[PDB]
Design a protein around this ligand. Structure first.
Ligand code: FAD
Ligand code: FAD
Ligand code: FAD
Ligand code: TPP
Ligand code: TPP
Ligand code: TPP
Ligand code: MG
Ligand code: MG
Ligand code: MG
Lengths: 585, 585, 585
């Protein structure tokens, strides 16, 4: 007969399979809290200590699962605290629903306490942004918000006046269209564009396949096409893991969160196959300036020819198109280009290994990640924060397709380590989860280590304490005339922080302390969360984008200093291998 | 001859007397950081651990001093982290300048890393919101932003492309108009409106003067007019302290962060003089429904007759107008209304005193604030956060006009305790500063306890740990049908948090522990910061807005339960004193 | 007991003294139309043919009277049509209330016909911008909107769901605050600052007083200061008429809608008193590059030191401050500067008169304005459109303090001639009202010549038909390398247009036709609107900003071609006069 509007709303969420949602209560959202209380056995409300962690975790839910992430905040400061999480979702194009509290209709526009016109606040970030003004339509307005967030892969925001969820509406007049939701059966790629793309890729002397997360399902195809046609493989930083890191022709990513082989190969390549990629640096770094042919495959029309003058752009699904190229090619024998790149990758990985393998004295980030690699399970998930850890994790973590790693890819908000590991462990309680965060990123959301304790989420948290905003110090070293300002700061002892939130923790600062501490952490994380605070040296990581190793481009003074500073004595430039296999530079 | 644009900009700030500014560096704001580095002996850059603390502290600067507060943030997530601080400034109408980083002009609109159209993000909160596109005009654009923030008492936002501060501009072509800034000499209030207002106030049988922070300078006038004409005085919560708290006819504030005498008197009053007030609850609580005449004095035309049908509204300065009323009145002898209200205030203060004066057993918020009162210096400044502490601080802190207390008055963002005490101690290094925060408000900005350590700011931090969002639990108790959800949580041991940031701290939970701990804290705070974590009981404070003490309005069962729960056995309703002095109710 | 919400909203408008309002009905604003129908005897609705005319007339009301202009539009297209009128009110800082229709609250957010979230559309232009969601607070929201538009001198926009005006609210609950209304306080001048300003003014060798419409109430003091101290006067184009144009030492306005004496003088001046002026061209034309001392007087702090570094700034009412200067000074004797300037003004006026007094020939703009002046009454109001007509009206109309002229001063929207004239005849039916419009400007709002017929508003409409966008053509001549484009077009016979809307009209093209035609127009306009379509030549008005006259700065060939083109054979540069009185240039 009747039903309360707020109860109907929680049922629309239950209909769309929403398992858990995050927020902090307040008077302006208490009628929705009331509805959640009755249904607490069907949808799990996770109370966070700061709302941006709720919004960031909701984004990570959708990143990991493909399902809509949900968070809420009370009127005014509850809702504006969501901003860094909602912009992350807009930028990383994943579906998120945010509910914002608002004063009742009876007191709106009266200029009463913590009441304002909230609709202008969400206009930029949200794809759908509405203030609900009627309780009977409120279930449809919520269903509308979810349909559009999914369809448009973005943020949908509904500001709800607190009095409407307590109203009665006729129980038969609302529905959730979850039952109509579906995946498209897309057409097969047109055979002539596939053939045209293949010929051009076969005649290339120095070819590359450069893929992004759009090729997430084409792991097998990419790797087989690589070794069948003798084409090196390189990706964007987030596409790391689609092809296993130990694959001998994986060059890594290009630019600063990058690897030496990827950068050098890109400047020599004559034909690039750009697949499901939208690398933001293409134009500003003139990455493709020496490319002769540029071939592209993307599912989205707005991307076609965006990053460079494209010769052939196929609008199609990456995996289908790669499987169709694969189906018309045969083995090619090892070329000079294949051989030179393989030798270069071996030289690089030996460098990274000698850093990782030091066994005594002062702790550096490199060995902390070798110890992370030692205790990692083959399907672990990593929530990585933003800073030097994106660079070091991309070089040292040895991922396979069973792993997941997430960060704030484009907006790049700091603080994402902790919320992402909370979302990961809620979705996958049986998978090992790691949170790799630098000290500045981890202090921005440190209060939510208590949420991991409260909901008993066994996360392995590793904080890299350098008493610096390392990523920025290095930039200041490169651009600034006057001394470093704002990048070195006071120590925070995160094992005391973790103890305050009643979580087990260790602090280490010598390489030799690592093995024991990490074995204890692997065992504690079978049941409880644990934190390791690695006090590391402030060494600058080798800048892949400022290599000074070639005698024809850098003077011997520069090369000696570069080799010295970066312990890069045994690194050879690509040109050494090119000359060796009979190629020029 | 030439000067670099970023150097000229730091000089425009120095010209407007900007002593310190807050932020966190990033690549998109490094050319401004470079300029700050050279001038580090003239403007003090304070690096915070989270940008909302920088924006909130900048707002508190202007709250305390009347001078423009300045903060900055890098592009994307640096700038959106400022939101809770900037909305606080818009709402509390104080001048703040925020500088937002942005990618260089050369890469803007190229869709490159952490680059977006940032101008839509600041459109709602800012009075002035511009992206600077030329380096020669950039000193004028900054000067423009400060002039308007001051003139309009609001937020001015400038998004600066990083490449323009490193450009050369002719040194003679820029200036800062600080030299033209001035206070208006306002006209004296028109003598006939003052006389009309006075007659109506003199004929009132049950009068009240209800003032707000607009009467900040009329402390003497308010108090003398009170005792010369026998008129009780009541204020808004932030106007507490303008007249000393021990003044026998100060009734307190009305509504929930309120006091019993203020609430009861307002329903009996026949003539209200509303002075420099903009109480947000006037309409939604029907506060003035029984008022017969409503007289108002405000400096701002948009306020005149806003909160109620006003009989006489004088547009003038509060202090000038009160001094002019005072100049034409003589002593009146004690009326029944004066006498009844005085007796009622005595009854109330005895209640608050018996709570404060318990000497053993389980710690409650009441005694923690009696201990705060004991060590307080006559001119201490209090940064108060948002939650039950606004209610308890308004009842127990004994302020005088030499004190300052600040919070987020209208927007009411949690987290303001720590940034406000940082701003207070930077401006006034010789004054004792307190930060009174509840546990949920203090965990939102807990990482910046490290900033107090790093810049050596001796703040006394007192955290009230109830393992609850107390203010919200009580609301749920009043409105919600189903059980409490989201308002009780895990303990955080803030003396371990404080130890992690290398600050001295104590944790107490028995009334008898207070005196020693507070004496030690008063002495440590002579040189270092200190934190006390008071573990308190979850007792609900007496709800002044839900009194059940009058036998003619509430049944005896209700009154017994009310008296029992709130240890309010000896509280009498106002009607007892009205009947006693020959007045009806 | 109850009243309808729509009736109370109209009662609030009546209370604030609103006599007339403009708009076009629609389903979404039909409950407001219903209310208006009931009140047709007390408040008068003016139906326009296009909604921007309604917004432009609403703006013109406030410009002419100082009282708030009121306009409305229906949902979607009705409201977006108001845009040019509303930004004109924002830019020329005048109070306007715009009511926007919206679908009822039940249909909102259901994506039904002509229903969209309308609140983001108005966020940039409106000082106050809200959607009403409740019928009982709707009178307060309308009252709030008028208070803020007056106080803030900007636009207030309220979007109203059609159902709410048809609900019954209690009659007892609403009120309008119109009775408490006051204008802002005028600050008083500090005598010490005034003495300093006066000393600097008297020590000047070549002084100028440059005033804007902030000196509206000080024409007497301005002219008196000029005659007593022997200092010439110049104004912004909108300030023309504050001092009578026939005054011998009134130099005119600077830059392009300028008069040659003002431009020449400004370059020689050593001290400028800048009074209630916000000239937008200061910095970009480097106007004050030679001014040794700049003195400013303004009521607004955001303007002090804004346009140039100010040596003495006074924050006070212009009239009060000018009265103070005048009381400290005595008669001075004629200087060379005074005499040089008067001689230059006689030369310039003699030149404009020669263009005006041609008796036979092809018609030019200059003789048509002479014809307007001969039939103009001493207190006529001029609604002027935008284009060359501002340049020509500024040079040829002889205005006194009894006249009024309005245009779109800073937004500068074409189209305003017809709406400004409608509003002026509504407000001042006893005054002669002119509409002086170029053909491009008149074409954009031509349909509302019918509003003048329908409402019997006797306006004299004068269209200047040059078959060009003359103002742009002359800009293309100055900047464009390739041929003229989009500035010359087909003729529209406006007498046939007027005939179509059933108005009396005439078409002229030879100078000798003018006298009889304007005589007849002057007679018809006592009862009916009349239009004259003056077909004029394509002659460029003398560019007062590009004077090729002085032999020592321009070649004899440039000078002769200039004099030939502009019929300026008898003009002398100010240097001739400066030299005659022993001065240098
Ligand atoms: C601190 C920091 C610095 C960074 N530095 C770097 C760096 O130096 N180097 C670097 O590489 N990255 C870096 N990144 C990440 C970077 O900002 C970009 O987000 C990233 O390069 C984008 O990768 P993408 O192209 O794989 O994914 P996206 O930008 O998400 O784009 C995916 C693309 O795939 C297409 N697509 C989707 N599905 C399919 C399908 N099924 N078939 C076909 N096409 C499809 C999409 O349409 C889109 O074009 C950094 C991140 C951080 C946090
Ligand atoms: C958790 C929380 C709850 C709250 N609960 C309450 C509560 O229950 N009770 C309560 O009272 N408050 C409460 N507040 C504060 C409340 O939200 C309002 O901000 C407060 O009531 C406004 O006080 P005000 O009128 O003094 O100041 P403002 O809102 O700042 O307004 C000042 C007024 O003075 C006028 N003015 C300025 N200068 C002059 C002058 N020189 N001469 C004349 N007029 C002048 C201004 O124009 C304006 O009208 C709460 C705050 C928090 C954080
Ligand atoms: C096609 C076109 C071209 C134009 N070309 C020119 C041109 O070449 N030259 C030109 O002059 N104009 C020109 N204008 C007008 C120009 O755009 C500006 O609108 C104008 O210069 C502003 O003049 P103002 O200073 O009088 O008015 P406003 O900009 O309105 O400024 C008024 C000032 O007076 C102050 N004030 C208000 N009241 C008082 C008081 N009581 N006491 C003291 N201070 C007070 C105000 O705060 C403000 O500072 C043109 C307009 C158009 C449509
Ligand atoms: C909220 C936010 N503020 C500022 C930045 C700019 N930023 C990018 S990396 C970085 C420093 C990262 O420092 P930390 O986490 O300590 O790690 P490190 O690089 O030292 O290992 C900063 C400040 C950001 N992206 N997000
Ligand atoms: C950032 C933010 N989120 C949510 C709120 C809503 N809110 C208002 S008071 C309150 C609880 C305060 O709790 P706490 O600080 O623990 O103090 P207590 O009341 O328990 O003493 C909350 C969540 C707010 N105003 N600001
Ligand atoms: C609505 C609008 N569109 C375009 C312009 C640009 N503009 C300014 S003056 C002008 C030409 C004026 O034409 P017209 O009204 O015929 O006058 P003329 O110069 O020919 O006398 C134009 C197009 C404007 N200010 N407003
Ligand atoms: Mg770091
Ligand atoms: Mg609490
Ligand atoms: Mg024209």
């Amino acid at each position: 007969t009747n039903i309360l509007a707020g109860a109907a709303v929680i049922k629309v969420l239950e209909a769309w399979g929403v398992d858990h949602l995050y927020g902090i209560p307040g008077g302006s959202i208490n009628s929705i809290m009331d509805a959640l209380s009755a249904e607490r056995d069907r949808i799990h409300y996770i109370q966070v200590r700061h709302e941006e962690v709720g919004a960031m975790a909701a984004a990570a839910d959708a990143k990991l699962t493909g399902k809509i992430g949900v968070c809420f905040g009370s009127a005014g400061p509850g809702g504006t605290h969501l901003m860094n999480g909602l912009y992350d979702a807009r930028e990383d194009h994943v579906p998120v629903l945010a509910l914002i509290g608002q004063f009742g209709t009876t007191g709106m526009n009266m200029d009463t306490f913590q009441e304002m016109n909230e609709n202008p606040i969400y206009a930029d970030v949200a794809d759908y942004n509405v203030t609900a003004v009627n309780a009977a339509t409120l279930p449809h307005v919520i269903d509308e918000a979810i349909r559009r967030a999914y369809a448009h892969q973005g943020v949908a925001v509904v500001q709800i006046p607190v009095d409407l969820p307590w109203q009665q509406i006729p129980a038969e007049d609302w529905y959730a269209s979850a039952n109509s939701y579906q995946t498209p059966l897309l057409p097969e790629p047109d055979v002539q564009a596939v053939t045209r793309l293949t010929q051009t890729l076969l005649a290339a002397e120095r070819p590359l396949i450069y893929y992004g997360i759009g090729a997430r399902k084409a792991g097998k195809e990419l790797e087989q096409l690589s070794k069948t046609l003798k084409i090196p493989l390189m990706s964007t930083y987030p596409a790391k893991g689609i092809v296993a890191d130990r694959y001998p022709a994986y060059l890594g990513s290009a630019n600063r969160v990058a690897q030496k082989p990827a950068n050098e190969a890109l400047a020599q390549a004559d034909v690039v196959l750009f697949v499901g990629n939208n690398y933001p640096f293409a134009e500003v770094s003139k990455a493709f300036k020496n490319t002769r042919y540029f071939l592209q495959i993307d599912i989205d029309p707005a991307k076609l020819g965006k990053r460079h003058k494209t010769d052939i752009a196929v609008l199609a699904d990456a995996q289908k198109t790669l499987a169709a190229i694969l189906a018309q090619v045969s083995e090619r024998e090892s070329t000079p280009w294949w051989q030179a790149n393989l030798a270069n990758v071996k030289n690089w990985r030996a460098y990274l290994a000698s850093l990782e393998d030091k066994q005594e004295g002062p702790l550096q980030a490199y060995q902390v990640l070798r110890a992370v690699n030692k205790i990692a399970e083959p399907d672990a998930i990593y929530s990585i924060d933003v800073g030097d850890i994106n660079l070091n994790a991309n070089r040292h973590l040895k991922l396979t397709p069973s792993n997941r790693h997430i960060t704030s890819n484009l907006f790049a908000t700091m603080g994402v380590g902790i919320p992402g590991a909370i979302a990961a462990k809620l979705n996958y309680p049986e998978r090992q989860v790691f949170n790799l965060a630098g000290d500045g990123g981890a202090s921005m959301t440190m209060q939510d280590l208590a949420t991991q304790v409260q909901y008993h989420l066994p996360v392995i948290n590793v904080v890299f304490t350098n008493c610096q905003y390392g990523f920025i110090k290095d930039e200041q070293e490169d651009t600034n005339q006057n001394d470093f300002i704002g990048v070195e700061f006071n120590d925070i002892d995160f094992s005391k922080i973790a103890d305050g939130v009643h979580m087990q923790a260790f602090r280490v600062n010598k390489i030799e302390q690592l093995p024991d501490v990490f074995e204890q952490a692997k065992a504690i994380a079978q049941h409880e969360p644990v934190l390791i605070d690695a006090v590391i040296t402030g060494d600058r990581p080798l800048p892949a984008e400022k290599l000074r190793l070639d005698s024809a481009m850098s003077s011997a003074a520069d090369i000696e200093a570069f080799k010295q500073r970066y312990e890069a004595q045994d690194l050879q430039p690509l040109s050494t291998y090119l000359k060796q296999f009979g190629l020029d530079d």
